[PDB]
């Protein structure tokens, strides 16, 4: 019965709250206070990447830490060589409303999707020497917001239809469907071991998913508005979420609650992208105001600022070796910072 | 080697310039409307599980790409941001009076959104033959939904569109004035609403859009050429 089940759900919510409060013997701030501040993190723009006609919506580094793909809503994916700023590829998209792009960890494929509700997989290593649409994954009933390769044959995508999906690229059919979110799923972060992924979905809640079982292991709340970005902590035991309430938050999977909140009274704009540094000491967050902030992920202090974009900072990315961070903005420029 | 990489980059950049020409010369429009609005029919008047439809048409050698939202959920606060650089939003609203307050709220949200606060709205008050039939019939009263209509009187400077009974003119101009009030009460001259009385059968809708885009582009040219 509806009312009976509602009361049961509320009682279980109280039980979970009490359990995670009992686990909350101490706070992260009370434990990290004895560590030395990180200091002022001063970072400079080593490169600026020009060539996109419209706003950049997403970017993703290659595993080699040199090549990076960016997607613009003028209808192009550009694979750049960040060292020289040479454009390695320029893929014209069949739908110009792209909202996400991904780089296969092997470098052989890229992926992109958007308001067309389709994840297009592009083969970069064709024998003919020209890029082609390898596959078109269809089945989502809403815009794709994020996508991320598990492998050359598996990709996990999040959609505005409130569900995520694990696909088999060879057959082009959803191997698994992840359901349980109520709002649009905005971003997903794949775990370092690739056996889990987290997703933030415009309902002020994030969820942890087991790829193989296809079920929601944990649900984390604490945000006041939509979650636009989610990133895994490098060890894979925590993740950071940025939201429209103008705060970032850190969640630990095993403690199952929120550890730290990164916010300031002078920030009244939403977070569009988040990323952790190589060691996880610095958390980099792009904001609706045109500059990014670098936070001491342990002490929750704003260690630095990356200013230099004339419009919204839409995407963020740290290389696998941690040598540089790329920021892409709605002014259509990607800037590499170091 | 590095020389070959630079050569490939330059070859790519040539194509990028070639595409920049086309991208800059084309005008992109976002077509918004409710289910009852006849926007689906307006698209068919542009005779030159997918989540977006594009119809590309041409007026006096100018190319317009008009985008109609396809299979999307009713929550639009996120994908709407994709359209912060279109030249215009064609907002189609049915005149049936009741969904009018819903359309007013949609227009208000579009107008006051941070990312749509510089986009001009071409407002198609569609289905005006239906509005005339409904007003003349007398069975449906606008006052039952908009009490301020009980004391609204037609402005003396309003164009009459000859052949309209004064009641039809009063009703249609009150409906127009609602949206115009929403548009002028907030923001500033950074964007403009262009109201039109239209029917889905009208063959001049395309022309209207053209006439409005010329103005919209004009307003940006005044800035781009140091005139304001």
């Amino acid at each position, epitope marked *: 019965e509806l009312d009976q089940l*509602r009361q049961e759900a509320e009682q279980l*919510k109280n039980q979970i709250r009490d359990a995670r409060k009992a686990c909350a013997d101490a706070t992260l701030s009370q434990i990290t206070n004895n560590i030395d501040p990180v200091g002022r993190i001063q970072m400079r723009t080593r490169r600026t990447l020009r060539g996109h006609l419209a706003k950049i919506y997403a970017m993703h580094w290659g595993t080699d830490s040199r090549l990076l793909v960016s997607a613009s809503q003028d209808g192009k994916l550009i694979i750049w060589d960040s060292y020289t700023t040479n454009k390695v590829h320029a893929i014209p998209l069949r739908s110009s409303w792209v909202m996400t792009c991904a780089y296969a960890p092997s470098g052989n494929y890229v992926a992109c999707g958007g308001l067309d509700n389709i994840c297009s997989i592009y083969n970069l290593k064709t024998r003919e020497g020209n890029v082609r649409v390898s596959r078109e994954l269809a089945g989502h009933t809403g815009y794709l917001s994020c996508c991320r390769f598990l492998d050359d044959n598996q990709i996990v995508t999040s959609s505005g239809d409130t569900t995520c999906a694990l696909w088999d690229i060879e057959t082009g059919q959803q191997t698994t469907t992840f359901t349980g979110h*109520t*709002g649009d799923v905005m971003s997903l972060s794949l775990a370092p071991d690739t056996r889990l992924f987290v997703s933030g979905a*415009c*309902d*002020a*809640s994030a969820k942890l998913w087991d790829v193989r079982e296809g079920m929601c292991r944990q649900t984390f*709340t*604490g945000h*006041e*508005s*939509d979650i636009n970005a989610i990133c895994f902590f490098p060890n894979g035991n925590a993740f950071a979420t940025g939201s*429209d*309430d*103008a705060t970032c938050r850190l969640f630990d999977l095993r403690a199952d609650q929120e550890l730290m909140t990164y916010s300031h009274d002078n920030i*009244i704009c*939403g977070i569009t992208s988040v990323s952790f540094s190589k060691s996880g000491r610095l958390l980099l967050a792009g904001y609706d105001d045109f500059n990014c902030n670098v936070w001491d992920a342990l002490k929750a202090d704003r260690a630095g600022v990356l200013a230099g974009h004339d419009n919204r900072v839409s995407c963020l990315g740290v290389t696998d070796d941690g040598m540089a961070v790329a920021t892409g903005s709605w002014d259509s420029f990607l800037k590499i910072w170091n | 080697e590095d020389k070959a990489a630079v050569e490939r980059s330059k070859m790519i950049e040539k194509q990028l310039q070639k595409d920049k020409q086309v991208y800059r010369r084309t005008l992109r429009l976002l077509l918004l409307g409710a289910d009852n609005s006849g926007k689906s029919t307006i698209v068919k008047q542009m005779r030159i599980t997918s989540g977006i439809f594009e119809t590309k048409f041409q007026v006096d050698k100018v190319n317009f790409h008009m985008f109609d939202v396809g299979a999307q*959920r*009713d*929550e*639009r*606060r996120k994908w709407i941001q994709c359209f912060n650089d279109v030249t215009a939003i064609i907002f189609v609203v049915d005149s049936s009076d009741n969904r009018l*307050q*819903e359309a007013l*709220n949609d227009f*208000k*949200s*579009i107008w*006051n*959104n*941070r990312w749509l606060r510089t986009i001009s709205v071409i407002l198609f008050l569609n289905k005006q033959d239906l509005l005339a039939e409904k007003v003349l019939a007398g069975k449906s009263k606008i006052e*039952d*939904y*908009f*009490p*301020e209509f009980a004391r609204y009187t037609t402005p003396e400077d309003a164009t009459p569109e000859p052949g309209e009974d004064p009641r039809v003119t009063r009703a249609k101009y009150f409906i127009r004035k609602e949206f115009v009030d929403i548009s002028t009460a*907030s923001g500033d001259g950074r964007h403009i609403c262009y109201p039109h009385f239209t029917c889905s059968v009208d063959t001049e809708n395309a022309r209207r859009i053209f006439n409005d885009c010329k103005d919209i582009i004009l307003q940006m040219n005044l800035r781009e050429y140091n005139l304001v």
Partner: nanobody, 128 residues
Framework: QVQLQESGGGLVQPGGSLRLSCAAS????????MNWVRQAPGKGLEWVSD????????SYTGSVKGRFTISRDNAKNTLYLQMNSLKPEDTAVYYC?????????????????????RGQGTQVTVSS
């Protein structure tokens, strides 16, 4: 967690009055515009009224203007709708919704497909 709990409202005779209250938890109540929405039997969701962060700006739908009044108390994180001269057509489930993001002027909160930041509603019935 973000939760909105509405109380008050029920069976009332035509021409009566009812004060609906909504307690908000999980977010800074003063940073968001608040809205009253309703769903009548056999119809879709309909926006009733809205009140800004400080209450300085208010708006009502025409069918209720002059009868209902919206108010907010930020110290108590509560939203009130005082409804006078109830009409039979006001029979509906009343939901309290809030703007999706803080410090904004626009709202997108009448959606049927489970808008996240509104409550479960309270039934208000007007009958003889």
């Amino acid at each position: 967690q973000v939760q909105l709990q509405e109380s008050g409202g029920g069976l009332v005779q035509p021409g009566g009055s009812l004060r609906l209250s909504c307690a908000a938890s999980g977010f800074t109540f003063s940073n968001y515009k608040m809205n009253w929405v309703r769903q009548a039997p056999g119809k879709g969701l309909e926006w009733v009224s809205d009140i800004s962060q400080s209450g300085a700006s208010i708006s009502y739908t025409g069918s209720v203007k002059g009868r209902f009044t919206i108010s907010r108390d930020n110290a108590k994180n509560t939203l009130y709708l005082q409804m006078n001269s109830l009409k039979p057509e006001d029979t509906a489930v009343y939901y309290c919704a809030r703007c999706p993001a803080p410090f904004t002027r626009d709202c997108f909160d009448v959606t049927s497909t489970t808008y996240a930041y509104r409550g479960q509603g309270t039934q208000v019935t007007v009958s003889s």
